[PDB]
């Protein structure tokens, strides 16, 4: 399915350069095309956004939910035990950090295969494409990866590399992965594709609810698959801050220095002026030696005032500069509603959309995938596939 | 009023960026060269008359202040125009109990009858089409016969 | 395995010069390529970061965790007894200090061999390389060391130096150490390599969980093995502070001095001016003697204002300038959650990532390695290899 990616590459390339061009002025290297941001109020605002939203969506407390509901309690308390011991909060911080930059981070959550260390493989927008319908559901997802020499298992790599050729011992070849909705059936089919062909013995199917690959957006906009971010609407105000304060500091460094101008047709030499203990009296007219004195004290103040205006408005733009209850008591008890309502009132419906596009499908794929090799006995028959209540 | 704010602050920032830079003008008929001026550790003494090198100094500090004052006026009036800048009870307690009437009355007193019109053009027909459409394949048994199609009371 | 290091040297050299170039403006000599930093707000911010994070990750209190759980209590209270009497907090301060400069500090924790003094040998990024996969696990680690003459034990050194040659009595030869994941097996194999060959009788194996060599990062970034730091995104703002305040002080020292200029074609001599008790009247016109008076009082103020701006923003950047509860009462009781939440809200997910990449593998390798020569009887059979619950 290399041709599908190369065809609808044009369907993602407007979203690509927006994401990359809006990444540059707020974090160095979450998107390539060192080299530091010149001044970085956006870099702190972004991390504060992530640090608030991590406590907002799901804290350490119970977030996911007469004689029968004890079996409801165990199946929804075992998932929080599985969610920490596999280190989910390590990579979901990266996910949400990508979410408030680009717009569409994927979250691969592969099969357990025991009780080992299974990491949430993340993907960024320079690797995958999604097609959506008029109503707003997924149709097909085409992820790409580069693979090194020995990082792939050698189970398959004999036949796909037996076509001919002596290659370098770190040859980076691209591999693809496609999931698509069937024509007649409502199940999704998944497979990998290497070297421009199907793989030996890897094709699989998945039920209706729980896709193995969860796409996400942060602001919903119909008509197309992906979505925007609100740093895409503070982009120009941040761009003006960077292109202002670079000029501010590079003006300050020129103003600080002292290039003393001495007259050439005078009597004084600078060679005697260079050697000077304090107190001695060296010859020379007091007219010749002067200094640069470029004389912009008030002209700096307009730049510092406009910078203060941008600095103060970006402060309320990115949830920063807020006296809060970070002075907690050993746990976070009622904190998530305060921070959640404040980020709702400052950012848009991000606490609303991430409760039905992040809190929902992670719980669905982790109540499907974890129960494949079933590690907890479900006692009742009435609510074997119960509701999924997120957020509250 | 918003259009004037955009077409003002674009000029404000693009004035600030020109004022921040330093295009030092050196005289051409002088003795000083800029090539020696470019290389300068702090403290060394390089030749040259102190008349030739000057800077732009476009000199509008007070003329910026009228633009910043008119921007402050628009910024302060748009603040009350769009319900922003209001100390509220967003410091809630785990739920919203009595909050909806306070916010509703404040947006009524600031925006017009939007809380009135959206209680009879949004809260009403969504409830009507969701008490018709959901009961087509009926998922809850209606017990009484007296109020099978009852009233629709919205807002309050 | 000298050739493996010399091959993927290119895989680390972008991370090398970033770490070394970002070390220079914040601490003198945690990385070579005396010579003091010119002005050093970063040097204090870095040590305050370490001093907060040391109480954050693990204090003196119990951090690691009906009739059966007493045996859980002893095995997790003996490890805190072993963690102080071998002086771990001495070298882990160096480790975390390397962590918020470079990005990848290794923590060797060799075998006990009794109950002697066994030090956590630290490694820095100029000595070792790690390869990672697409999911994010380790594959191979190649550490380097230089060794002096008699510092190595002489158990082996006869055969490796019997190749021929009369060498200097402090000849620094490099030695290497490789650990790698097997092709078929899931155990790691470890060995040393001296002089470009295998060593006599030293090759060993290790179980699945507890690697003897624990790599670490501070901000997670997929696609490559190592990682960045947030001083890599305050680098330019700190660099401007150093290159500003060097000019500030070297302007102040020139402005303080007094090189009095006397006219040469006048009547006054400076030789009579040099000798002067207060009160006497010495001859001379009051036109000839003047002073330099370079006259930049307002031009200094723009440099001091821009320095104040950088100084105030770096203050909140490095957790400094925070009124806290360092006025404690004999112990730290509830303190670790306050400091932990504040550094979470200021630095990123460092308290999250170091609870699953520092607090986890140290506990795993110290519940594997300490129980080799087993010093505490495990009573129950149900939780002999129990869970590892970190952070909380």
Numbering used by the authors:
A (entry chain E), C (entry chain F): 13 to 45, 54 to 85, 104 to 430
B (entry chain D): 275 to 430
Quoted passage from the original study:
Phage portal proteins are key viral components located in a single pentameric vertex of the capsid and they act as initiators of capsid assembly. They are also critical components of the DNA-packaging complex and are involved in tail assembly. Here we report a number of crystal and high-resolution cryo-electron microscopy (cryo-EM) structures of the T7 bacteriophage portal (gp8). The structures show two conformations—open and closed—of the portal and suggest a possible mechanism of the channel valve that regulates DNA passage.
A second cryo-EM data set yielded a higher resolution map than the initial one used for phasing. This map at 4.1 Å resolution shows a different conformation of the 12mer portal (gp8open). The overall structure is similar to that already described (RMSD 1.03 Å), with the exception of the conformation of the channel α10 helix, which is kinked in the middle and deviates “upwards,” instead of pointing perpendicular toward the channel axis. The kink occurs at a region containing two adjacent glycine residues (G386 and G387), which provide the necessary flexibility to change the orientation of the N-terminal half of the helix. The movement represents a large swing of 90°. The density corresponding to the tunnel loop is partially visible and reveals that it is in an extended conformation, allowing the connection of the now more distant α9 and α10 helices. In gp8open, the kinked part of helix α10 occupies the “upper” cavity of the channel or α10 housing cavity, thus defining a larger conical channel instead of the two inverted conical cavities observed in gp8closed. Therefore, two clearly different conformations in the T7 connector were defined: one closed (gp8closed) and the other open (gp8open). Although the first structure described in this work (gp8closed) would impede the DNA passage through it, the second structure (gp8open) would allow it.
